[PDB]
Design a protein around this ligand. Structure first.
Ligand SMILES: C=C1CS[C@H]([C@@H](C=O)NC(=O)/C(=N\OC)c2csc(N)n2)N=C1C(=O)O
Length: 358
């Protein structure tokens, strides 16, 4: 249709996503965009190959590390509720760890990847007893607060501590309190039986259909399954666009900037770059998950900003996801795929789509 921005947005998105899917052999994708208070959802391809099922409005994708932002939102909710202080030590809240290295690690450190805990949970830790034994024996290579090391283990502690401060399990905190209050009714840590037909298969590096295996503290770090529509609602909530007072305060406060590292500002799990955004710096800023970098505190912390590009990547064995939004422009994007394809491509496609939107 002529003279309508919807047709123009669909053209932009189609022209980038179809070649992306072709050259990376991605079976199915959903892309959700919000701009000018309006929402646009585009579905491509297959949620499963055999029996084949199309991607639809109801299709659930694994979002991997986007799950970390929900642990951060829970901790922020606990903070604005007066139940959690981010400057206190981890061992203050986890008394089994008193006397260990966690006497000198703050909750803020595990919420900003500055504890020094390693990226991956050790494979042989299966239960709480093994986890605590590992944590009581652990010592960082550098003092907590000096370096940024992206960590699933630190995120796990952030979510565990937040949930306990609210007097519930993490799974209950998310599925009975947080997601319902955000109106995200098709988002789960455990997909129920009536939604299994909507749960896309992921396709791994051998093109085999796979679903994520949930291990200890995995809910916090990589457990969320959701639709692109639900995550677009989350993006709008993070920009204050929805009615839904403590929940809005909690969402906004996760965008507080606590450390600078490389090109990015580390917020509470979210990461942000200056807007207008340099594509080279956006690419550099999204290549920080596996190496150590120097972290410099921002004190007083930088208040939540409008004139920034806020983003998070996530992946599992079978899936690749990305969210970005710019509060000053009330625009955002969610890209979900059932193949894990390189983050530089996710970020470049997102940059091109949001740059087209004014
Ligand atoms: C570089 C990393 C660090 S781990 C981080 C995390 C967040 O999404 N994902 C995982 O830890 C993970 N599985 O957890 C079940 C993962 C990443 S890549 C892959 N084949 N599995 N993801 C990525 C990525 O490529 O996106």
């Amino acid at each position: 249709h002529a003279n309508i921005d919807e047709s123009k947005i669909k053209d932009t998105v189609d022209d980038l996503i179809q070649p992306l899917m072709q050259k990376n052999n991605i079976p199915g994708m959903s892309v959700a965009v919000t701009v000018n208070g309006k929402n646009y959802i585009y579905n491509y391809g297959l949620a499963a190959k055999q029996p084949q099922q199309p991607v639809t409005e109801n299709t659930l994708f694994e979002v991997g590390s986007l799950s970390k932002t929900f642990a951060a939102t829970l901790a922020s909710y606990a903070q604005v509720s007066g139940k959690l202080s981010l400057d206190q030590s981890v061992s203050h809240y986890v008394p089994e760890l008193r006397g260990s290295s966690f006497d000198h690690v703050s909750v803020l450190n595990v919420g900003t990847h500055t504890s020094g805990l390693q990226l991956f949970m050790p494979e042989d830790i299966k239960n709480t007893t093994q986890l605590m034994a590992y944590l009581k024996a652990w010592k960082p290579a550098d003092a907590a607060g000096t370096h940024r090391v992206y960590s699933n283990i630190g995120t796990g502690l952030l979510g565990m501590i937040a949930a306990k401060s609210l007097g519930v399990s993490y799974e209950d905190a998310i599925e009975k309190t947080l997601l319902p209050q955000l109106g995200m009714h098709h988002s789960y840590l455990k997909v129920p039986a009536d939604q299994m037909e909507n749960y896309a298969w992921g396709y791994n590096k051998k093109d085999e259909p796979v679903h994520v295996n949930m291990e200890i503290l995995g809910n916090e770090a990589y457990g969320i399954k959701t639709t692109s529509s639900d995550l677009l609602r989350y993006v709008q909530a993070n920009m204050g666009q929805l009615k839904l007072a403590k929940m809005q305060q909690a969402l906004t406060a996760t965008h507080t900037g606590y450390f600078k590292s490389g090109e990015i500002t580390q917020d509470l799990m979210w990461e942000q770059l200056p807007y207008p955004v340099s594509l080279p710096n956006l690419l550099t800023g999204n290549d920080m998950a596996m190496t150590k970098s120097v972290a410099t505190p921002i004190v007083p912390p930088l208040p939540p900003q409008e004139n920034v590009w806020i983003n998070k990547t996530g992946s599992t064995n079978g899936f690749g996801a990305y969210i970005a939004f710019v509060p000053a422009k009330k625009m955002g994007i969610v890209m979900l795929a059932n193949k894990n394809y390189s983050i530089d491509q996710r970020v470049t496609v997102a940059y091109k789509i949001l740059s087209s939107l004014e």
